[PDB]
């Protein structure tokens, strides 16, 4: 075969090889995070009660009087684990502290970009759908959050450009997995709609600069 731009390739009948590969669309190897270390030592005030109707997290302290500058930026880093208990505990901790996060999510927004991207930089589809769901939850559950994320669009959107054209060409087959919202590109579409909806008139010029095939809604 031919390596490339050489005179072996000058042959009228030669076979040249392509470039090797790139790391895009392939799962990047995981790293140990702070969540397991802080959990196995007994720091988090949570304990799983295995309810029959679906599992629910139990808080033995009052959630409305917790430190959101210490728990939430480190609960967000727990999303990057996919073993079994830690992903559930981190996901439901983020969901149950965003639900009761009245006027306490605004100052901690610059402290949670790094765990969000670090969880998003692993090319696992389940963790990406989970992070997209919690990012959908993040912009809605309070006020003044959406336009506070506007200067951070240039560092969370690059991985939101990868899987947006991932969907299913099933023809006339109704998607039996519409319940389990695992189609990643559809989720990216609603998440970008949510980012346009909250964020003011400076939103569109910031999804456009990052994602070039977006289209202005609203």
């Amino acid at each position: 075969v031919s390596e490339g731009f050489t005179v072996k390739a000058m042959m009228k009948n030669s076979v040249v090889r392509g470039p090797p590969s790139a790391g895009a669309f392939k799962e990047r190897p995981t790293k140990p995070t702070a969540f397991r270390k802080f959990y196995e030592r007994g720091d988090f005030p949570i304990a799983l009660e295995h309810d029959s109707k679906g599992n629910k997290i139990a808080w033995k302290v009052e959630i409305e009087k917790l430190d959101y500058h210490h728990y939430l930026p480190l609960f967000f880093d727990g999303l990057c684990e996919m073993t079994f208990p830690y992903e559930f505990f981190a996901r439901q901790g983020i969901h149950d502290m965003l639900e009761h996060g009245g006027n306490k999510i605004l100052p901690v927004i610059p402290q949670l970009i790094i765990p969000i991207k670090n969880a998003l930089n692993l090319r696992n589809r389940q963790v990406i759908c989970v992070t997209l769901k919690v990012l959908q939850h993040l912009v809605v559950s309070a006020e003044m959050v959406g336009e506070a994320l506007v200067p951070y669009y240039r560092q969370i959107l690059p991985i939101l450009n990868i899987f947006k054209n991932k969907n299913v060409n099933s023809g006339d087959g109704i998607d039996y997995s519409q319940q389990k919202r695992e189609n990643i590109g559809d989720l990216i579409q609603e998440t970008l709609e949510a980012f346009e909806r909250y964020g003011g008139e400076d939103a569109f010029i910031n999804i456009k600069y990052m994602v070039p095939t977006y289209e202005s809604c609203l």
Partner: protein, 182 residues
């Protein structure tokens, strides 16, 4: 096609409820997809078609390119969900002068050029679901001197949510229309 059919008060071609909706339809998709979804606005199945290029992916109403379907019904109604996206659809009609003429309705147009093969016209839409009304006889009466005898083909492009594309003999109000056509 559809020559030995009665062509009643309403004639339906596409429907998201059933076994094979795109049986007589062609599936052309390039950088897009075709799929069916239980909708969260009407609690029923709706055809879904979208792609990054609006002209590459579509569905044409006779599958065979040389075969054409014949509809003598004058009015065209289609239920589409407005996703605030680029959506075009185009018909082909016959005249008493035996010329196949086309009408193009484009979401990204604001102008109207009339020409002896295709007359392009703009299109606006409301928020969500809609009943877009088309009188083919009027469109062949104002732009063109002739009248309408037979519809030949209809095309639906991407960035849209199709349910129940049909033809009707006359404008049916909300009362006389059966509940399965809403």
């Amino acid at each position: 096609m559809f020559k030995n059919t009665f062509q009643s008060g309403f004639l339906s071609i596409l429907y998201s409820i059933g076994s094979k909706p795109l049986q007589i339809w062609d599936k052309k998709v390039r950088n897009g997809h075709i799929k069916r979804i239980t909708d969260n606005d009407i609690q029923s199945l709706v055809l879904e078609i979208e792609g990054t290029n609006v002209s590459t992916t579509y569905i044409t109403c006779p599958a065979d390119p040389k075969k054409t379907l014949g509809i003598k019904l004058p009015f065209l109604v289609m239920i589409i969900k407005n996703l605030k996206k680029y959506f075009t659809f185009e018909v082909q009609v016959l005249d008493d002068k035996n010329v196949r003429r086309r009408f193009r309705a484009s979401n990204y147009q604001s102008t109207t050029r009339v020409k002896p093969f295709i007359c392009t016209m703009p299109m606006r839409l409301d928020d969500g679901w809609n009943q877009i009304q088309f009188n083919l006889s009027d469109f062949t009466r104002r732009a063109y001197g002739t009248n309408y005898i037979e519809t030949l083909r209809v095309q639906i492009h991407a960035n849209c949510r199709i349910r129940r594309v049909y033809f009707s003999d006359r404008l049916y109000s909300e009362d006389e229309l059966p509940a399965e056509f809403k």
